[PDB]
């Protein structure tokens, strides 16, 4: 009944905080680019809209454009989510759910994303659920620290206090709404 | 392939600028409601998504205010569209359709959808094509001018009688019936 049902195969969620090291650990993967659907976060896309850069308005002006940046951050997991393969095995670089759960969850909490907005992306993640088929067999989660995170960034900028909100929302999700087995790294 | 595909009934999609007598005119069916789907504009809805009122905000506040909202009308109508029915025929007053081509595409020239709002509904406009199943058999046109829908700005009701226009007598295709609502 759902879009893209029963078109795809095995599908690994890599998911962890800002700078723990998932895009590191998907390069590792890369030289299986033939027999591996690998799919690394769009960033790319989300800082060319047709032109437009969306990631950096978001950053620059919050309340105003978290709400359009987010619903195309939602569109292009989707896209990434329902992309057909011929391949046995597909990873991707997060997900819907860690968008829903950790992003778009911590920009309610901070109103970055009035009641409003949030309520809008609520309602368009409810009725995708109903609607468009999200494969996932198993996510990988690359635990660590807030403190160690921070420092992969100051390295290659965001608060400290941040990316602690963000660990205790991938927290509650992966350790503590989402069923489908969990393999815990240590990213430390 | 597509959610909903196979799934909906002959589906009518009663169109036209507002103050067009569409409500009026979607009243006639209404005493059939139990062999025909009546699915009428929920503005309901949009005046409150769970309290908020999105409609109000819209107007009071465009240039912000604007993507949620009709980010918001294009997931009513969404919803609308891929309702399941027993029934022989579905009949909705407006559609995605006009939703994109008409108010989207004018609140882009009068600026209140930035251009990277804009392309985000688009996107997701371009998303939704591939991906949900939306049956349009044949599309009402209650056709009017600007003029008498006002007597029912006048200017904003010009901009979108144009796009109606644009969409509809001269690129959505099912046929298309002309009515004069005038
Ligand atoms: O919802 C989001 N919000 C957000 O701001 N980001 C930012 C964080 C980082 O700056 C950059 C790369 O992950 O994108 C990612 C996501 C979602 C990924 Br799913
Ligand atoms: O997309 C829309 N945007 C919009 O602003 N409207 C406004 C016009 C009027 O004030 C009121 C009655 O429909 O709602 C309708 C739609 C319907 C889309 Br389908």
Not at 51 to 65: I, R, T
Not at 142 to 160: D, F, G, M, N
Request: proline content about 4%; glycine content about 4%.
């Amino acid at each position: 009944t759902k879009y893209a049902e029963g078109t795809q195969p095995f599908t690994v969620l890599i998911e962890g905080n800002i700078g723990s090291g998932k895009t590191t650990y998907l390069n590792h993967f890369e030289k299986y680019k033939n027999d591996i659907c690998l799919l690394t976060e769009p960033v790319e896309k989300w800082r060319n809209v047709n032109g437009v850069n969306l990631l950096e308005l978001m950053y620059k002006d919050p309340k105003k454009w978290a709400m359009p940046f987010q619903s195309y951050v939602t569109l292009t997991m989707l896209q990434s989510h329902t992309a057909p393969t011929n391949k046995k095995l597909k990873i991707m670089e997060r997900s819907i759910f860690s968008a829903r759960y950790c992003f778009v969850e911590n920009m309610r909490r901070n109103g970055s994303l009035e009641q409003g907005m949030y309520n809008t992306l609520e309602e368009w993640y409810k009725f995708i659920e109903e609607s468009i088929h999200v494969q996932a067999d198993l996510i990988i989660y690359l635990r660590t620290s807030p403190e160690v995170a921070y420092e992969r960034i100051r390295q290659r900028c965001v608060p400290l206090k941040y990316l602690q909100e963000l660990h205790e929302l991938h927290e509650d999700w992966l350790i503590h709404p989402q069923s489908c087995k969990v393999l815990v790294l240590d990213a430390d």
